[PDB]
Each structure stands twice: as C-alpha cells, then as structure tokens.
Amino acid sequence: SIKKGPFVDEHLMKKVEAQEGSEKKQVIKTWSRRSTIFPNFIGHTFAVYDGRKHVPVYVTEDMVGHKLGEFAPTRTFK
Amino acid sequence: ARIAGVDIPREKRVVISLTYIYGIGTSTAQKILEEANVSADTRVKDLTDDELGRIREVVDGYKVEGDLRRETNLNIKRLMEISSYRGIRHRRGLPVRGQKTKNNARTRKGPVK
Amino acid sequence: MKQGIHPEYHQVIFLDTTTNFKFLSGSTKTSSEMMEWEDGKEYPVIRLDISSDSHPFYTGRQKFAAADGRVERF
C-alpha cells in the first residue's frame, strides 16, 4: 500500500470521535469494509459483515498495517 | 559447513550456493559479499581459515537474521491468528495460495492427486 | 586401573576469540599451533569454540518483528 492519507473516514470517524465521549462503546454498525484506523481505538466490536446482523471483531492490538476488517468472519470450509 | 548449520557440497563456488539454509541463499549470498576479500573460489574445501571468521562475524553482526528470522514466518502468523490472513484465512482454513487455491494443479499445500 | 574399554583420550589446548576458555578433557586430533605452559606443551590443535564468544543465556540481543507502527505518521 501507500503512505500519505490512510483514508480515515469523514462520517465514520466523526461518529467515533464524537461518539467516543465516554467509555460507552458504539463502534461501527456500518456493514462497510472500507474504513481506516487511528491509534485511538477504544474497547468495542465492529460489524464487519452483512448477513442479517452485525459482527463483533478484534479490538486490541490487532493487525497493524491494514485499513479494513481483515479478521471478520463471513465463511470457512463449509 | 560453518556459516549456518552445515553446507557440505564441493567443486562449486561458495558465493551463492548458500540457498539451502533458510531466509537467504545464492542470490543474496552472492549479493551480500560486502566484506574484506570474500569471493567465490570454486574450491569450497580450500583457501579458507580466518576469512570465514570475519565474513561470519558479519553474519552474526548482520542483524538481519536469515535462519534466526525463520520464525518471522511463524510470528507474523501468530499476529494473524484471528482469522485474518496468512495464519487464520490461509492456515486455519486449510486453503491454497495464488488466490487460485484450486483451478490449476497444487502439490505443496495439497500434496494428494 | 582396569583397562579394556575406552581407547586413547586426554586433555588438549584450545584458544577462542575471547578468553580462550576450552581446555578440559578431550579426544581431539589435529595439527599443533604453538605450545605453552599455562596450557599444553604438546600438539595444541583443539581449534576454537563458542565457549566464551557470546552466550544467549545471560545476555541480550535484538528483538522481534515490530509494534503497532501506525503511530509515527504511518
């Protein structure tokens, strides 16, 4: 990938930083797999799936070079 | 024989014939010849007493590891074992690589045809 | 002494990069360098070891892959 503008979302990270007032964790709900991340991620899921819900995801010191939901299940073997 | 583990063969040139031992081999071996008088001699069992000492003290001072970093494979897998990639979505899911897991032939991950 | 088991083997001489610390019992044959009285006055050709060059044991070295990294401008 490239440097220079990791693509922190405007709407999404607005929803974060202004919904990151307290410890109350409302993370994404976004059913969207396009974000990009800061060091200030504070304990919460994501929803990095769109089947009929919203999927909890990795929170602490996860994959560090990525800009999306690299760990989020949708499928496997069968 | 001495640079890492052992490497026996003869009659050939020591410059890149390092390919056996992990991390590095031949290509980098003949491209990392950055020392004081180390070079391919076609006599892998001659001409060498202390030159190996210095051009090995480098390999220990070559903090870029090689064999010692054989485990960066395993440890970058260790980071990914949350079903991400190269360890969970490529090792815990038992799939192939090339992102043609199976449309062509495959022996290394699936050895059974 | 009851002989009829092990062959011929005694002490030898070996000097290292550091401190020259390998002089215990041996069975090692090779060609003499130059002999002493602080150590062998005989074929000195136990060669050289890691015996005192660096241990990993009570020592330090370089670390693993890396940290988060998206903290210094990414």
Added chain:
Amino acid sequence: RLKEKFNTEVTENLMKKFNYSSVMEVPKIDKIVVNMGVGDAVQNSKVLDNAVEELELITGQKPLVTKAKKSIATFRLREGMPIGAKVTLRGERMYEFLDKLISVSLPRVRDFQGVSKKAFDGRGNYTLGVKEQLIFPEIDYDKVSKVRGMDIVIVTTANTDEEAR
C-alpha cells in the same frame, strides 16, 4: 578442569548450601548414567554405537528394554549403553555445557523433578556438537537420567549454577 570444576565452585557452597551437622551430610554431586537410545531395531541401533566413543567412555554394552510393553520389546540391541559415571568418567559428556550450542529450550521448566532421579535431555542435536554433522546428522536418541544431591527441587535449585538450567 571439569572434574575440578566439580570442585572449583562447589566445595564452599556444598559446604554451606544446607547447614547440616557435619561436612558429609552436606553432599556432593550425584553420579550420572550417560545412556543413549534408538528408534530403529536394526541399523540405526546397530550403527549408533560410536556416539558414546564420542561422548561416554563405555565401548558399548548390549542392554535391551525390560518393561517392554506391546511394541517396545526387543532383544540384545545396543539402544541403551550403561555408561553410568562411576568415578573416572563420572565427569562425562554430561557436565560439558555444550547444551548452549543450540540456543533453544535452555530453561525448559519451573523446576526439575518430584522423583529425585533427574532427567536432562539434549533433545535434538543439542549435544556432541563440537563434531561436525558427518554421520551424526541422522536418527539419534538420548537418555540423560540421574539423581542429584538434594531430596526435592528446593535446595537443588538456587545453587544449581553448575549446569545453569
């Protein structure tokens, strides 16, 4: 060297590590039983006979499995040579500190043994390594099991600086 290194550090500690009554209740090093093994019943066992000429002092006896359950049992093969340290070789390939010539699994455990008979296994190619891998780069099993001069792990432990593991 080593035989005196079974003295150079230890006579004062092994005269103090305990605070027993007389010098002789306060022990020395317990003797060793340098033993090797095999995982083949024929040729690796028939051709793993010298590595003792390398490490031990015994020419090579031919003891076999005794307890010998369903598929352990065989006869007369030289899988376990009785090269136990009596007094002369009681400074054998054991107290050679060539277990650092691996740089893996130095401190294996929090402790060693609830049975005083300790086992210290150079598993892999940890030991006899000052010899290049000519014929020693094939199948080779070890069996370094012997007791020490301490009833449990406790005082055995924080004076064990001899073999430092």
Added chain:
RNA sequence: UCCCAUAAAGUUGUUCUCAGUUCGGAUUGUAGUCUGCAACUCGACUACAUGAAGCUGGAAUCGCUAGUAAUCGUAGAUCAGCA
C-alpha cells in the same frame, strides 16, 4: 520517418562437473512497481529469492516441404493493475 532501442536468440559466452545438487520462483514464508468510492476467503506474476514440481514418458499427450513453428519477441486494441 520520427518514442517504446538489451527488443529474444544462432554473435566470445562470466556463473553452478549430475548429490534433487547457485535449474526452480510453486507454498509452510517477508510481499511489493502505481491509476482505484474499500485484497479476510474478492486473480497476478513475482524480487527480498521459500529452492518445490522435476532426469523422456502408460489403460492416459503437443508444430509438420520453408522463416510459419522450435523459444520468446516492440508493445498494447479492451480499458483507472493484469495475457
């Protein structure tokens, strides 16, 4: 005409005397040229070279009387990646 100009070989052929051996670019690896509103299962081939498939071929397979093909070949029509 005028830019891709070593275009790749037959032109001297550095380099590895038959051990899977300095032949390898497959996976158990590190991943990358730059034009994307976002490579976890959502292609690459790769160099940093992981040294594997391999040593002539079955009940199971490939050009053929001139430059066509053996081998590739300047590139790209198609189109913000790649024959």
Added chain:
RNA sequence: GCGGUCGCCUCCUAAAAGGUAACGGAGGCGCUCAAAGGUUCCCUCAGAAUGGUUGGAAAUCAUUCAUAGAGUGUAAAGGC
C-alpha cells in the same frame, strides 16, 4: 454297537504317616545340551512412577518403594 481311549511323568479328589476307586476335574513326555556338564571366583527378583530422536500408556539406562508377587531349556508340584 458307534465313538474315544490302552505306556511313562505332576497335582486335586485322598478324611495332618504310607497306601487308596469311577467313561471323576486339569496339564504334559517318545527330548535337548560340547554348552545348558565339572571346578574357582564375581554378581542379583517382580508389580513403581520419574520425563528422556523417539515416545506406540509400553523404543533406554539409572534412582529409590522394591519381599520372591521374579527367574529357572521343556507341564505341574516340592524347593532355592
């Protein structure tokens, strides 16, 4: 009648000496060994777990709990 047995060795029945029957209940023998024979030395059993390429819970030598619960060329008792 058919079938099966017919000689020699060990134990139980057999009632604390010996002996003692039935188509009563169990096993064996028709050898083997120059050494497994004679003599002088020298040594020591099981069921026990240790954590030791390897582990087949059992591939090893130790260590200690080890009381004959081991081993005797061959079945069984009496013995060591």
